[PDB]
Write a protein that binds this ligand. Sequence first.
Ligand SMILES: Cc1nc2sc3c(c2c(=O)[nH]1)CCC3
Length: 186
Amino acid sequence: NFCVVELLPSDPEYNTVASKFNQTCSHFRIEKIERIQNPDLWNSYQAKKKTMDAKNGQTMNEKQLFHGTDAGSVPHVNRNGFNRSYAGKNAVAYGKGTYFAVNANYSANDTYSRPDANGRKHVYYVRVLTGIYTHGNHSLIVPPSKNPQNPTDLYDTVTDNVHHPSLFVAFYDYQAYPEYLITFRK
Ligand SMILES: Cc1nc2sc3c(c2c(=O)[nH]1)CCC3
């Protein structure tokens, strides 16, 4: 179960999200920003965060990243996050997983945030447990092993460019929490 709370332009939380979005997407008109409150999904995300925070030392395991999707996926994502049956997984080049962008402009592409019948576009500002990452490749269904001599000990995510990332691919449930939905237009 979940709730959706629309944020008022005056709210500092609205400002924070909007500021991030407008670094690359100020040419768009923001209609609204909503917080998604799904307790079970959040708890499960935090449970993953705790285990990663113990394991990776000084690593800042969490990033806030963007994900565009069609209107029709919003119900699915609000309930289940970016889980196995999430339809928006046609990008394959860095792995078969869910893609998140460092900057909003990637996610604002019409192929990802498909405008609906009323012209509105949908981008989530998502907490993602990027952890320790490496370069992705087309064949991945889970991250690569850190050392091939232990095939079961894997990276947390993959990226297009390890030292200047523009995207991250996550492969597991509870690795991303869909905290805010930004509804906007041209
Ligand atoms: C459905 C969806 N697919 C993809 S692939 C990709 C991004 C993206 C997104 O935001 N939504 C952002 C950068 C590379």
